[PDB]
Every structure is written in C-alpha cells, then in structure tokens.
Swiss-Prot record, chains A, B:
Name of encoding gene: letB
Phenotype when changing residue 193 to N: Partially affects function
Free-text comment about domains: The seven MCE (Mammalian Cell Entry) domains of a single protomer of LetB resemble seven beads on a string. Six copies of this linearly configured protomer associate laterally to form a homohexameric assembly. The LetB hexamers form an elongated tube consisting of seven stacked MCE rings, each formed from the association of six identical MCE domains, with a central tunnel. Rings 1, 5, 6 and 7 are dynamic and adopt open and closed states.
Range within the parent protein: 515 to 877 of 877
Record-given protein name: Lipophilic envelope-spanning tunnel protein B
Family in the record: Belongs to the PqiB family.
Region (MCE/MlaD 7): 232-348
Protein's cellular compartments: Cell inner membrane
Amino acid sequence: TTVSLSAETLPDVQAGSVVLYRKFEVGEVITVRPRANAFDIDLHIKPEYRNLLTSNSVFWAEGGAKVQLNGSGLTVQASPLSRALKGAISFDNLSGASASQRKGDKRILYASETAARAVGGQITLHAFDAGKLAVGMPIRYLGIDIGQIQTLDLITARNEVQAKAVLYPEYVQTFARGGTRFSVVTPQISAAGVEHLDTILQPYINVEPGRGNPRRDFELQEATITDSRYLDGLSIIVEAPEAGSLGIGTPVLFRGLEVGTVTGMTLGTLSDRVMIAMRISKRYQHLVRNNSVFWLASGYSLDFGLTGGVVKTGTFNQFIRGGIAFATPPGTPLAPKAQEGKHFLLQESEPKEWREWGTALPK
Amino acid sequence: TTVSLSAETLPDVQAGSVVLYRKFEVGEVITVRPRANAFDIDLHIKPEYRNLLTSNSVFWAEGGAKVQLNGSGLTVQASPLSRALKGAISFDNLSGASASQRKGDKRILYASETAARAVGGQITLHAFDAGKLAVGMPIRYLGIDIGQIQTLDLITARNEVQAKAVLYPEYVQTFARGGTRFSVVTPQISAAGVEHLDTILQPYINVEPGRGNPRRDFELQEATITDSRYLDGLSIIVEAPEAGSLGIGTPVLFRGLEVGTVTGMTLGTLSDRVMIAMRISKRYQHLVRNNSVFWLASGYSLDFGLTGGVVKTGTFNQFIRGGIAFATPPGTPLAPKAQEGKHFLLQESEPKEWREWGTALPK
C-alpha cells in the first residue's frame, strides 16, 4: 500500500485494476472496502514510480468501455482488459492541488476527470433558476475555459440557487474583482437567425471581467456582452425617458457603422429617467464630443403625404435590437472629447440635417 | 438468507447474481421464486456487512448491459459478468425509508433506481390530460428536483387523470401548503424563438410555492411563473373590462424596464370585469403609489394624419405577451405607497404627458 483514497460511489474495482498515469498503465489497486458513506481504496505503485506522484496529485476514476461520441469516430477503449472487466483509475500531477490535500484527511478519488481538475479559487453564484445550470458546466472567457461549476444548492429560505464554482489559479486574480458579469448562454433559434448551436449539447457560462475589490460573491445575469472588443474604450451614460427596444448588446451606430454597444440599463438615482450605459471602441473614441446629439434609431420609420407617400424599409438589425445612432453638429472649432463618464440625453426624434453636416473629425 | 423481497416483473436473476451496495459487489441472490403476481427473492449478505443494511434501506434492480446515452460516451457496464449474463441488484440506505417498511409485509424490490428514491410526503394531482405526464417525471422547484410522479390513474366517473406524486421530506412542509401551482413545461418552438429544449427528451413539472393550510390535494395548471424573483414583493390587483393579450408571465413595465409579471387572471366576484393579479419586485416596490395610472401597452400602435402620417415599430415583446405599463403622476407631496392588496384599474389608452412627468421617486 502506497496511497489510500476515499471515494463515494465508483464502479472502478474490487481489487486488481491498473493505475493509469498520463493514460499509461503503472500501478495497481489492491484493496477497496465499501462503507455506508464512502469507499476506502488502497493503491500499490512500483518503487521507481513512487517519485512520480507528489503532494500536488489528484486521482480520478472511470469505469467501462467509454465509447466517445465525437465527430469522426466511436472510439472504443483499447484498454487493459482489467478496465473492460472492472474499470481503471488514472491520475496526474498539477499545479494547485496542494489545497485539495489540506482539506480532508487524505486524498479523494474523483468520479470524473474534470471533477479532479476543479482546483483554484472558489466563488459563489446566486441564480434565480438552476434550469440552465449543471455540475461541471464550464465558465468561459472569450471562448477559452477559465472555470467550472462544482455544485448546485437550492435554498428555500432565500428563494435562490447557490452554485459554487471554481476559477483556475491563473484567472482568480484577474476575475473575481467585482463588476464581473456571469451569464449562461442559450441557443437562440428564431426567424431572424440561429445564434448559438453548440450550446444545444454543451452550454456554458460567459463571463465579462470587472475592476474593483475582490468580492468573490456574484449573481448570474440574463445577458452579457460577448466580445470584449469594446471593453477598453470610454463608457458614456446616455439618459432617456423610456427604455424602448434598448437592451444589453444593442449596437451604437455612427453613420450606420457599429462603433459600440449598450453595456447595461438602469434607472436613475431618483426614478424619473432610464440611463443607458454604453462603451465605444478605442478606434472610434474620437467621434464622441461634448456636443453629440444621440437619438433612438429603432425599428422602421416610413413616411406619408397628402398628395402621396413614399416609404422606406432598410432590413435593419435595429428591428432586432434597436440601436442608438449619433452625429456631431458642425462647428468651426471642435468641442473637446467626451470624458470617461459623460451624460448625454436622447433626442426624441432624428435631427433633420445630420446627413448634410459632414463634420470633419480627424485622427 | 438475510433479507427477503417482493418484486413484480424483474429480469434480474434466477440465482447467483451479486448484490450491489454503493455500486459495489457485496452479497448474492440465492433464491427467487416466480408467482402469478410477484416474485419472492432471497438474498445472502456477509456477516460483517449485515450492519451495513438497516430498517432505512431500499432495494432496486437493473438488468443488462446498460449503455448510457449521455454526452461524451456510450459507457458500457464494466460489471460482474453475472450482471451481463443475468443482471444485478443494488441498494442504499437513505433518510425516510422507514415509512416504506411500515407499508407492506416486507421490503419491495423496485424496478428502477428512481422508483426506490421516491420517498416522502405523498400528494395528489388532478389533471385534465395525461398526455404530458409520465411515471417518474420529476417535479422541479427553480430547476432543482424536489419531487417525482409515481403513478397515473384514469378516472371515467370524474373526467380527469389523478397523478399521485411524492415530495422529498425536506420539501413537504415548505410546499404542499395551498396556493401551490403545478404545471408541466413544454418545448416552445415558434418564429419568435425557442424557449425550452431539454424538455424534448426530459419534460418536468415546474412548481411555484404557496402560503396557507397544508392541503395536499392539487390540480395541474397551464402556465406557472418560472422564476421566483418576483415572489417576495407586493401583489396588487388590477381591474380591466377585458383580458386581451394578458396572460400569466406577461411583464409589468416601468419606463420600458420590466419590474414585475402578471401572476394570474380571473373574473370578479360578480362577473363584470377581469381583475389581473401581478407582483412587483422588492427593488421596484417603491414605484407603485396610491395614484399610479396603469395602461395596456400591448401590440403595436402607429399613427396617421390628414396631411401625412408617421408610424412606429419598436420590436416589442408585448407583441409576444402584451405588457402593462405604469407611471406616477407628478405631485409636490408624494402619495403613500400601495398596500399588499390594492385595486387599480386600467386606463383605456396611454396618458399623453407621462413622458414629460419626471416624478421624483427616491430610494
């Protein structure tokens, strides 16, 4: 006996399966004993390989011929036949597994490979619904996996589901700083188009980072800005009497080209107006001046007359998410650039002569 | 022989398969005898393991190489070959299995793992249709599984299907209190969007809790408020001459932002008006005053003139579910906040100057 484990319900072995290391057959399980809560598993490894496991080592289990589904092949496990008859145990060293040994009396045999990889800083999410969540669901920043949900707990006192998740130790300092948005992504299949389709089989959580004090207590949003191409530029606040078709992700347009998005929407400190937070790119940051009229270009507008009318349809994406356009009035000196937090207000209608302005905005 | 069972139709074993405990091979089946109603099964367990089963112990059966469908793998049962040739029997201790031994002469071998887990308080549902129901169908609160349907019975006297279900013993006091809404969830695939897609393969029952006396006799609704984010705030009643596009789940809007939903719709005590129950959040509870005009903002409204008309489209979700908006008229003292049950009435049209009001509503 070299290392002893604990495991709740694993179909791995009574005795005699092989220990895997980097998917390679080194070692053997010599004794399990069942218990009403959790097993106690004794492993043998060879003495030249006793250096190959250290304190930073997590063990995980798999059982049966695991026929992968992916793409080309239904790849059968060319395995030790011990895996076919009983099922094997694998392990690997990693970076931050020292904290997993500080907890518990000894190591724990995880039921899956990803459940062993769930190391790092441990945050808590507060969702109103766990219908979109799952254990082992990845948390992805820019499509790259940075975290993982490890449990889901229902609370009946506070009507909410607390999901505890981990962030991998490279990302626990960068994220978990407050102002960090978490959101599940769902497949969007409409008449307008299909947006996400991998999330049929494998949903995940998108994350947008924030700046502030290390909170490590978050709640799960409804929508989150997906691309971080607008994360660097200025974040002006735009005031409106009503929300309308505005939502998170609604584009901001300069002459029909998308220069920013709507970050979030909230009411005022005294509830008389809806103030809309939006970020502009670094490239198009110089377009926003101290005099820049903003207006709601949302949906379709068509005209009519007494002697005759002529209408326009322009296949707008503002019929999908009604975008805010802007322009700068002409002035022979230019007004200064907008600061980081600058409060504009919407024009109730489109200005008449903005197509005729042609304000020279350099650089 | 240690423990004797009864089982209706199970392909487990004639003699010699293994007894599983926490998915581990401990024990053996020594004698079955078939009978016209139900088997009688004799089990042997080792004496050091005779402490590992108690009165709170349920037994269940499975037969064959059960190739799971889920995600990554078609995982084959790395099993005792006794399971491959015949099929095995598993068991586990749990909390509330003492009542299952008080019923019947002895224990019963369930045909599945979930059918053994169906312990707790036993409620009864009255559905008009069992086309959406099934035995073993989960009952979920906030996406977390709290119960299970265990039978479906058709009654020809009262034209209804009585489904008897169980609630797990943590939740039988919290739920089953009257004013509790049960509803099946169906996949909604439209031109407007796809709403539920996991319910293609695995439908469930959503539940909204209530407050009152412990009824334990319920009926299955058509729609139920999914998220409990509006469960805490005040529940005002709003009176209308007609229903219209209003339904359960229809949003309540303040300046275009969603502050509540419509809970339920019913007629008056004398049938001259439709009164609409709606709940507002705790955050936006201070927005509702004793003078707050409500109006139906449902569908699309566009204008026209003699000399010319100009129209508006705003990609409303009120074309999906026509939402009720509100606003507070300006007054230099504020009116008091609305109580828990406060009866308003709809304005037949939108007020003219509500965009120009700008009533200062603090906190």
